[PDB]
Amino acid sequence: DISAKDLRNIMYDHLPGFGTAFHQLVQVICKLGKDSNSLDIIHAEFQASLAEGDSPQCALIQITKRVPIFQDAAPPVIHIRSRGDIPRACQKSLAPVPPSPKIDRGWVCVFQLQDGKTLGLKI
């Protein structure tokens, strides 16, 4: 049995850089995974994807397409003060938020700014 913190660190162990769209997706996947008691199936698929030769980014996308809790799941909204509060490595990954964003379509999270503006983090 793996904890949410331990699984997040395993995933971070593989990812290049820091504050990337993929780091955020790790946090999203571990939160929904913990809350749905899906951490072990997530862990097992992540390990098999890597063994099969997938990039760790692609292992994470495969989890969102395959693990039942991500079926139809919408991204969380993260309240922040201003756009400068979004990690640098996320700054070229932001796009207008559609009506009904889904994580398994690549909408990782939505930033909502203090002025009301929303910016969708997109892969």
Binding site for its own copies (CB under 8 A): 1-2, 16, 20-22, 32, 35-37, 40-41, 43-45, 47-48, 51-53, 55, 57-58, 61, 66, 68-69, 71-77, 92-102, 106-107, 110, 112, 118, 120, 122-123
109 binds Na ion (CB under 5 A): no
35 binds Na ion (CB under 5 A): no
Which member of 14, 50, 57, 87 binds Cl ion (CB under 5 A)?
87
Site string for Cl ion, 94-113 (x = CB under 5 A): ----x---------------
Residue 52 has which token pair?
Answer: 């099969």
Identify the CA nearest to 111 among candidates 11, 100, 90: 90
76 binds Cl ion (CB under 5 A): no
Cβ–Cβ under 8 Å, residues 78 and 109: yes
71 binds Na ion (CB under 5 A): yes
- Contact partner, 55, from its own copies, Na ion, Cl ion, none, Cβ < 5-8 Å per class: its own copies
- The SS3 assignment for 27 reads helix
* Signed CA dihedral, 29, 31, 33, 39: sign only: positive
Residue 111 has which token pair?
Answer: 């930033």
Q: How far is CA 119 from the centre of its chain?
A: 15
